Curated annotation (Swiss-Prot), chain A:
Gene: HBA1
Site (Not glycated): 11, 56, 60, 90, 99, 153, 198, 202, 232, 241
Keywords from the named record: Acetylation, Disease variant, Glycation, Glycoprotein, Heme, Hereditary hemolytic anemia, Iron, Metal-binding, Oxygen transport, Phosphoprotein, Transport
Organism: Homo sapiens (Human)
Matching SUPFAM superfamilies: Globin-like (SSF46458)
Name by which UniProt lists this protein: Hemoglobin subunit alpha
Similarity comment: family membership: Belongs to the globin family.
Residues noted as binding heme b in the record, renumbered to the chain: 87, 229
Note: Gives blood its red color.
Tissue: Red blood cells.
One example of a Gene Ontology biological process annotation: nitric oxide transport
Swiss-Prot record, chains B, C:
GO biological process, one term: nitric oxide transport
Positions bearing carbohydrate: 1, 8, 17, 66, 120, 144
Mutation effect (residue 68 to P): In Mizuho; unstable
Modified residues (S-nitrosocysteine): 93
Protein known as: Hemoglobin subunit beta
Gene that specifies this protein: HBB
Length: 283, 146, 146
């Protein structure tokens, strides 16, 4: 979330960018294609050689769009509306790639703005490009529809008194599948059957039950949990995706009749929204 | 790919029960439903507008079976996934232009489908071994990308 | 880790111009500023209240230099990063409990720091070579996690 001082820092740097934004945009794509060659799969129709008119034009278009976003930083979803539609329905770039371009744009700005690229401005620019990325990927699936909310309530209703037991199973599945997540629990017994893991699973399932109950008001209902994870526990955001998968696996294994493709899709969306809320105060 | 005896045993035992036709189409269909941007590679497959259209789309079912068929063969050569998938790796990069991140999403959907189909028999240690394998296969398919 | 001779030379040439102490301190400070959740390991380092407090903290600077000194010595072992970093991998997992995701964040912040330090000299091909090296170093530090 862009603080007012964040907005000040971005406007500062981007002004300095000034008339070179298009050149810088092209350089960032060229850096991306070279450092992260999987990104070239989205441009097989381009001459991707150095200095190519197609790559230059791409950079200027992308630069103009970021200029638009800087100039409308307090209403980005609306300023970028057309662009969110096009990437969501037509281009369909996998979201992970936005992080790769954002890193190469940061690198480009660093290499060109020696005086301005201070630690605080770097932090602000990083947050700004993550917000842009978030807005551009926001319609790929589009936040919770009334059908999504119905599906979630129906499935979570069937979980019911088993909520805690499925939360403990989800953690155990996560620890065995993705051993790096164990680094957050060095003080627990992680063996199968562990009461500490059972207790953790219960707390998490209980919070989720609270989220389904307040599905139209999740940021307030989880505000204290958002604070806890961001300033105390400080779990790296990538791990929320790993637990969400393991929760989905757990539900599938216990709910053979209810876990339809449509319900699977709505649950994945719901857990991603929960994850978003829990990491929203990190920076 | 190195698996422990315990892990390789779990993988092979469960795989003998898998109907490659049914599971394969299920996994590709759910990928297209849950992550709809993956539909960008299948424009010529017909109607994929609703979960029901997707799941019952026969071209989806046919392609799904083919994909899982090639995965199945890879289970035979767990010691050399790279060499086994080299030609398909080059294919997916040079001709099909598929972002390797899709292989990871497909792997995770497959694990979801296995849990759904097998229930309590798909235990935590069994999932863990399958997660290793799908990660191995995805890295193998991404190996020849340039 | 496999780099071409060209890339190796590109990495080595630039590194000869680096002041390990200054760059090391700057990269750790920027990591703690830009991704503040990474501060979770350094509550004994004292004042981390603001970007300026972070960047001028002597304990931050000292740890930064230590980290980059180990990085630096790894650059002389690009063909055996895993064996070179094996014991440090076990240390960060069993005793320090550091999520390997932090190593990737650290690697990206170091690349920004080099670009800031060296400007136009930090060309796209030179960047590409460092991106492989910090990825390779991160994988090697994560190798012994269990
Ligand atoms: C900050 C992130 C991004 C912004 C602001 C952005 C913006 C744009 C804009 C303004 C256009 C042109 C729209 C038009 O002319 O109708 C475009 C096109 C495109 N973008 Fe994005 N983009 C971003 C990230 C990405 C990423 C990460 C990729 C892929 C790795 C990507 C791939 C494409 C493709 C394939 C095109 C079409 C090029 C053509 O064939 O003309 N974009 N983008
Ligand atoms: C759906 C995602 C999550 C939710 C809703 C959630 C919720 C919670 C809840 C309810 C607590 C207990 C707070 C209290 O003591 O009152 C908690 C604590 C904790 N969470 Fe999260 N959590 C989530 C994801 C994660 C992830 C992915 C990790 C790390 C892999 C994690 C690690 C922790 C840790 C380390 C604790 C404290 C354990 C203890 O000392 O008792 N959380 N979480
Ligand atoms: C473990 C995962 C996968 C394996 C082993 C696999 C295997 C294959 C095989 C054996 C073919 C046939 C090539 C030929 O007929 O010459 C193929 C084609 C194809 N694959 Fe992959 N695939 C996998 C994942 C994916 C994913 C995730 C996508 C995209 C979301 C994808 C998209 C395609 C496309 C578009 C074709 C061509 C179909 C056509 O002819 O219309 N593949 N794949
Ligand atoms: C490529 C990156 C890194 C390398 C090469 C590296 C290397 C080292 C070295 C050489 C030590 C000293 C071990 C000893 O006492 O013998 C160390 C300790 C430590 N590192 Fe890492 N490290 C890296 C990244 C990180 C990151 C990103 C974090 C956490 C955000 C971290 C946290 C720590 C901590 C907390 C210690 C212990 C310091 C103390 O006890 O005073 N390391 N690291």
């Amino acid at each position: 979330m862009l603080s007012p001082a964040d907005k000040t820092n971005v406007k500062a740097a981007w002004g300095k960018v000034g008339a070179h934004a298009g050149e810088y945009g092209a350089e960032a794509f060229e850096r991306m294609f070279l450092s992260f060659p999987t990104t070239k799969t989205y441009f097989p129709h381009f001459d991707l050689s150095h200095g190519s008119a197609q790559v230059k034009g791409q950079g200027k278009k992308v630069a103009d769009a970021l200029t638009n976003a800087v100039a409308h930083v307090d209403d980005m979803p609306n300023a970028l509306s057309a662009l969110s539609d096009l990437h969501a329905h037509k281009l369909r770039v996998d979201p992970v790639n936005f992080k790769l371009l954002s890193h190469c744009l940061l690198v480009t700005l660093a290499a060109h703005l020696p005086a301005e690229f201070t630690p605080a401005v770097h932090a602000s620019l990083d947050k700004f490009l993550a917000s842009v990325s978030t807005v551009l990927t926001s319609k790929y699936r589009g936040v919770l529809s009334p059908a999504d909310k119905t599906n979630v309530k129906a499935a979570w209703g069937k979980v019911g008194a088993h909520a805690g037991e499925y939360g403990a199973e989800a953690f155990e599945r996560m620890f065995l599948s993705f051993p790096t997540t164990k680094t957050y629990f060095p003080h627990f017994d992680l063996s199968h059957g562990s009461a500490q893991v059972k207790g953790q699973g219960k707390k998490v399932a209980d919070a989720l039950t609270n989220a389904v109950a307040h599905v139209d008001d999740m940021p307030n209902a989880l505000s204290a949990l958002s604070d806890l994870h961001a300033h105390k526990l400080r779990v790296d955001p990538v791990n929320f995706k790993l637990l969400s998968h393991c929760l989905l696996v757990t539900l599938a294994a216990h709910l053979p009749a209810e876990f339809t493709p449509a319900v699977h899709a709505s649950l994945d969306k719901f857990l991603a929204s929960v994850s978003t809320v829990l990491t929203s105060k990190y920076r | 790919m190195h698996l422990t005896p315990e892990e390789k045993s779990a993988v092979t035992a469960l795989w003998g029960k898998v109907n490659v036709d049914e599971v394969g189409g299920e996994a590709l269909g759910r990928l297209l439903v849950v992550y709809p941007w993956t539909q960008r590679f299948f424009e010529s497959f017909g109607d994929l507008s609703t979960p029901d259209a997707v799941m019952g789309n026969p071209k989806v079912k046919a392609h799904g079976k083919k994909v899982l068929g090639a995965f199945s063969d890879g289970l035979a050569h767990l010691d050399n996934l790279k060499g086994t998938f080299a030609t398909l790796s080059e294919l997916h990069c040079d001709k099909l232009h598929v972002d390797p991140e899709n292989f990871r999403l497909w792997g995770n959907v497959l694990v979801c489908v296995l849990a759904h189909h097998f229930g309590k028999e798909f235990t935590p240690p069994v999932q863990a071994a399958y997660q290793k394998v799908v990660a191995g296969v995805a890295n193998a398919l991404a190996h020849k990308y340039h």
